[PDB]
């Protein structure tokens, strides 16, 4: 009973479910926009903000503070109480820890990890390379422990505490952990392709393997909280469909558009997105473009869909790895999984179409925001296509399937450059962040500079360059995809 | 006859031998100082300059302009005249091309390579990753061609054109090419350890192997010019012994100090170095510190010593690669090779010393420039030391042996962080360049922004971040040494 209470704040703060204004700062005004998923019609701080590459420390500190207070602390506390005593809870805490904390390192680079809880005046940061090794080892520990208990036929003691689709089922938690390993493996393929291959193949070959059906998906099922985006969109009109989403989903005439977005008030019965990184004269100019749709009007918040497992395996197969299918088979299975998850028909026709491509983008009353399409690729698999075009197809479909979870899409975009996104028109970074490559990370936070200046200095050392949004984290090496 | 004339400008402009003021800008006021080899007593441009991390476009453009006009153009011209007709000359041009142009990409990152000589308005840059692949392939072509001729007993037709220690001997040119391959292979060990291993092992496996004795060293033997550093130092007093060299070489009581540097005029019979990245009141405050010594009072300019081949193999052995010998054997052999090269005795005692370490640095009349030692490692091999300490020993000895060739030392320092160097006290980069990590590259040059703006845009794209001195080139990944 003293252990079980630590899980709720972990579940409730991977994405901060309440209050909504905290989610808006934790993710809504960073990766949800940089990923190309969503855009704001509001000219916050005179239009000089995260969306125009002037990173705002007053906004971005919330990411660190809520994650450490609610995810990391409880991982630490649960481990202290359970490791070597109630190892099933320790194992489950490790899986949740990695789910929450990989997002943290993917945002900042170096982070506090091994030294968390230290009483030293300096709480040192680990390098991102070190954190990734630790996370893979933590998943090793968790998977071995739970698999042992499953093999023994041990009844779960986690159902009453679980807040996911899994209802305490250890096998489902292991399958999630395997899929999370596969995500982390693919993340590092440019910097450590040998480790990427090892960890990816381990994930797929583990007894219970990775996600195969939609019931395998990782989601938070809250008894009381709606996805915060519902309020930020429908109530506040502070976030809308993006121009990238309009270009790509209208181009493909994608039936998932109906659940992802609402038709526009300003343009009745039409799906209209807002361009990011623009000049904004008044909020009313874009607030009546398309809102975020029914997928966020729910107490269930998806954090990793089964579709992603297929697209990860498809990329692994493209790279020649032992993924259990061909790149084409896995690509097409991923698309079908997503169509099924969204409850829409026509997957077969969509999959076979080798004509439809991204559409031109028009901002009707502000043509300065217009663009020719940039993600110029069809859905249909072409065996004769280059590896880059094959990867572009896979990541495009992965990006569509993963909406509205902007953090993973931002990480995948940084790594692969896909899908192609419209560049910002206004860049107020003073040269620190490029228009072509956009935001590569967020700089170390105010609470840390205030209370842990010695730690921040270790973080800067392990970052290897200026502490701004243009400096690449360890896995985001300036290197080609193959 | 029409082909041979192209070689002289290549030989004479890897380091620009004349005029001396051009060498000062090409290398003397960048890597010769950033490497920790040398320091200026002169407060050029009010002390806001390359040495205080305000990169000066009017200085640094010389690197690109002289390299492309004299090395690259002649490689291109010779290839056009000789490829498929006189392949011995083509092969030799490729080796010289890689010797000159690897320095170029190591300085800027993306460079013009495959598209050189294009008539298009945009002459596109290649990525550094692409350039490295091409250089390895060029060395493959050169090595195969010359080895074929050697195997056939074909007499050299290059002696009258050669301006090195090799006197036209193809076998010595192949041995140099192998050693250059090994250098380039180790450079990329953090970004592409698989390719690093492949290319390093190829270098050693080739039938002539890498440099073994000092006569194998690559040097320019000028019939007319003295090393331009002799003038810059002795005549102009614009460059002096550095504080890092004083700390390290005095700490070890290294007998090579006597030929590397002259005793100070201000401090009779003492070796005194100047701190880099400082405030300078007047040139006279430091101009009478130690000058650069007898090693530059020569018409022979060393560009790759046999000692480096041993230290490359030593590091390869640390990594478990097929290098011939143990890390300890190769380390000690490299030190002996360097002592022999410089004509000094006492190698055995120096090699066995496990006490002497870097000395504290004092600027007698300006104590604000003082520092405790930072390269705190002894010479003696310790089998029980960590891989990092072993590497620190190897690179420290490599750094001493390679004086006064600052470019390779700067590249090795960027890759490994060794030897430890004194940080600058003044940093006028406006945040673009960190004090901790120093200059990682030079920004694209004025002549290119003026006459090839389309090409520069491709270079910036292939750089992956802001075009300034803090952005890391492809091989300079933020990753650990092992």
Residue numbers in the entry:
A (entry chain B), B (entry chain A): 45 to 526
Quote the study on this structure.
The studied chitin utilization locus (ChiUL) is encoded by the soil saprophyte Flavobacterium johnsoniae, which is a Bacteroidetes member exhibiting gliding motility. The ChiUL of F. johnsoniae consists of eleven genes that encode four enzymes, a predicted inner membrane transporter, a predicted two-component sensor/regulator system (TCS), and two individual SusC/D-like pairs (CusC/D, chitin utilization system). The resulting ChiOs, and likely chitin crystals as well (analogous to the archetypal starch-binding SusD protein of B. thetaiotaomicron), are captured by the CusD proteins.
CusDI and CusDII exhibit comparatively low sequence identity (27%) and may thus have different carbohydrate affinity characteristics. Isothermal calorimetry (ITC) studies with the recombinantly produced proteins revealed that CusDI binds the full range of tested oligomers (chitobiose to chitohexaose) with similar affinities, and even GlcNAc, though with much lower affinity. In this assay, CusDI displayed some enhanced affinity for chitotriose. Despite considerable efforts, crystals with bound ChiO ligands were not obtained, likely due to crystal packing, which for both proteins affected the predicted ligand-binding site. The overall structures of CusDI and CusDII overlay with an RMSD of 2.2 Å for 363 Cα pairs and display the canonical SusD protein fold featuring four tetratricopeptide repeats that act as a structural scaffold. The most striking feature of the putative substrate-binding regions of both CusDI and CusDII is the presence of two Trp residues that would provide a flat platform for binding ChiOs as well as insoluble chitin, as has been observed in chitin-binding carbohydrate-binding modules (CBMs). The area of CusDI surrounding W280 and W65 displays several residues that may provide hydrogen-bonding or electrostatic interactions with individual GlcNAc residues of chitin, while there are fewer such residues within the aromatic interface of CusDII. This may account for the difference in binding specificity and affinity between the two proteins.
